[PDB]
């Protein structure tokens, strides 16, 4: 019979920095073993210095992105052009999602920007609206390949101070946007080696107090 | 159908001899002479290609057989028993070795396996022992070069050099006083050529003599290139032109 869902592949990643935030995804779009496109962006600027990715079933992903963009615009209309802060956008998104609790949006959603204190923010969502603010989150195909790496090379997990022999944890001094980007790139190149869904291209959106910047890097095409 | 011989055909006599094995052994003694020599860098096995009628074909008479690309065998005695034994031998090298470890058996192991087949024929119901002795020459990587003799009893032993069949006692004596442990392959071939001469009653050329070497890897005989880790067979049967060519000595 008719099955209303599909999988389009893709992998996405968000790291919340100090005064910045990044949200990256591959630009490949797949169906089974076929490539639909080598460039089909999946990470979007939504206004109010908020970036969003809804990865998984692509038709569902775009429905959700469109609805949220609409929510931002209508929030302006209804609240004297007030800025939709990231935490509010996050609560808004829970409700968008939970509204379809019995015919879910088959997607895993991440948003990124800056909170009210200027600190970097990343929010991660269920397909049905459950959420948390997080330091960093990968979602989609290669998420299980990237998540352990980021655990290690970002939170310095299982690393201890040389010579103390596991008595002093290696201290987690935090990272420039430039270092965060190297980590993102190496995560994706590691991803595309070992996962058939990840490849083609990497688009990264960078959120600063000065707004949203975009960067692109090619990936292996096989 | 109705094979009712489930009892053994080789028994112990009261003297303690196993008659049928002695008789098989005897049939070997009356077989054409063949010999082997181990050099430092190779082995040679050799025998006489005694044509019955000159209408028979020389090549058709193989007494020297590849078993494994690094293992050859030759015999004295009943030739049909040998042909059969060769085919069991080749099959067992695959069946109990190549298909399990992914490589050809080392030379002693293949030998103990031919030995096994022969022993059973001295004990299984309804059969007689094989009427052959084999010399088997090979090279594997951990034992290097080796040369074995296997008898109809199932016994086998490693030799620096030996011979079986008719002229064995003369050949063994002559071999004993020419073998040192510093022969090149080439020397041992020449010695094998000498020792054969005495035992060969008549015409003595490259078409009446059979010769094999277990030597260097012949990547010319591989049939394919592209895998450097795979070199050619170490086994090589000499051509009549090759034998004749160095018969000038």
């Amino acid at each position: 019979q008719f099955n209303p869902y599909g999988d389009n592949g893709g992998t996405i990643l968000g790291i919340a920095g100090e005064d910045f935030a990044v949200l990256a995804g591959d630009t490949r779009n797949i169906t089974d073993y076929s490539i639909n496109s080598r460039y089909e962006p999946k990470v979007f600027d939504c206004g109010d210095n908020i970036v969003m990715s809804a990865n998984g079933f692509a038709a569902d992903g775009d429905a959700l992105v469109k609805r949220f963009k609409n929510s931002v615009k209508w929030y302006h209309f209804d609240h004297n052009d007030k800025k939709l802060s990231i935490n509010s956008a996050a609560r808004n998104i829970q409700h968008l999602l939970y509204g379809k609790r019995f015919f879910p949006y088959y997607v895993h959603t991440i948003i990124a920007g800056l909170d009210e204190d200027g600190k970097g923010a990343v929010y991660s969502f269920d397909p049905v609206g459950s959420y948390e603010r997080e330091q960093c989150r990968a979602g989609g195909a290669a998420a299980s390949l990237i998540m352990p790496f980021l655990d290690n090379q970002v939170n310095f997990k299982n690393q201890y101070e040389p010579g103390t022999n596991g008595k002093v944890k290696k201290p987690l001094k935090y990272l420039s946007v430039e270092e965060v980007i190297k980590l993102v790139r190496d995560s994706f190149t590691s991803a595309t080696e070992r996962h058939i869904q990840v490849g083609d291209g990497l688009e990264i959106l960078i959120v600063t107090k000065d707004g949203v910047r975009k960067e692109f890097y090619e990936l292996k095409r096989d | 159908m109705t094979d009712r011989y489930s009892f053994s055909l080789t028994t112990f006599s009261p003297s303690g001899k196993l008659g049928q094995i002695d008789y098989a052994l005897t049939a070997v003694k009356q077989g054409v002479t063949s010999l082997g020599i181990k050099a430092t860098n190779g082995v040679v096995i050799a025998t006489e290609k005694k044509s019955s009628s000159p209408l028979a074909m020389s090549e058709t008479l193989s007494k020297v057989s590849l078993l494994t690309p690094d293992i050859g065998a030759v015999y004295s005695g009943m030739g049909p028993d040998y042909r059969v034994l060769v085919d069991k031998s080749r099959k067992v090298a695959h069946t109990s070795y190549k298909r399990i470890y992914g490589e050809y058996p080392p030379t002693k192991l293949l030998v103990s396996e031919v030995a096994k087949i022969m022993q059973e024929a001295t004990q299984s119901g309804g059969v007689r022992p094989f009427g052959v002795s084999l010399l088997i020459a090979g090279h594997d990587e951990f034992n290097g070069f080796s040369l074995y003799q296997v008898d109809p009893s199932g016994s086998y032993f490693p030799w620096k050099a030996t011979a079986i069949g008719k002229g064995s006692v003369a050949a063994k004596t002559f071999l004993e006083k020419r073998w040192n442990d510093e022969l090149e392959l080439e020397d041992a071939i020449h010695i094998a050529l000498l020792t054969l001469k005495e035992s060969v009653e008549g015409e003595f050329n490259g078409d009446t003599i059979e010769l094999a070497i277990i030597g260097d890897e012949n990547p010319d005989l591989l049939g394919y290139t592209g895998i450097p880790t795979d070199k050619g067979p170490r086994f090589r049967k000499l051509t009549s032109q090759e034998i004749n060519d160095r018969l000038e000595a």
């Binding site: 019979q1 008719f2 209303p4 869902y5 599909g6 389009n8 779009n29 169906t31 076929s34 490539i35 639909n36 496109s37 080598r38 460039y39 089909e40 079933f57 692509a58 038709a59 775009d62 429905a63 015919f103 | -």
Partner: protein
Amino acid sequence: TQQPIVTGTSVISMKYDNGVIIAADNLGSYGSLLRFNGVERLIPVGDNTVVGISGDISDMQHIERLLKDLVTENAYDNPLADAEEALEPSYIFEYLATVMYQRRSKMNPLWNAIIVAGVQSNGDQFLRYVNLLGVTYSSPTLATGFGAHMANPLLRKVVDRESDIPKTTVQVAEEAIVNAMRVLYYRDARSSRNFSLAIIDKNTGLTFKKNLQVENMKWDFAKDIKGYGTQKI
């Protein structure tokens, strides 16, 4: 929730320096039965847009008349329906896309895969795809069904990245499409020799070629093929 009855196979297409090309064979199959040979599956809307439809043919005809209604209604109270406020390729796409995702969401899909091809007013090439799930994507080449597997690899050899498009001429583009249609005829069991092809160029406008045949086929070597292994005669 339905199941398709009368069907159309691949729609294939790409974009070249000045516009787009889109092709589709003229057949509606009824399962294994090759039932209807006159089926036009390229739907022109205006003169900047062709819409190629594969999938259920009853649903295509429905979509087809939606498009006419869309042209009629655009021209209501519109003195600019023949310029500036004429139908744009992207408008026609967003509409279809909207309907597709809505029908999927009602658990009663329009059982199709659509490729919308044309040239926007500014001059930009438009090429996008939507299917019975409402899934959408764009690429310099696009294809449905078998075309996805056999046509796309041939077409991507010509236009493999965006930077290849201003390099590709109409002749080269049109060449590829025709060869692809032949390969499909060789290897797709639901396909047809007769097909239609449309070119929408930013300077020549819409060019629509009907009743094309697959030509230049290699069949000769079939005389030498005997048996399935050991037979010599």
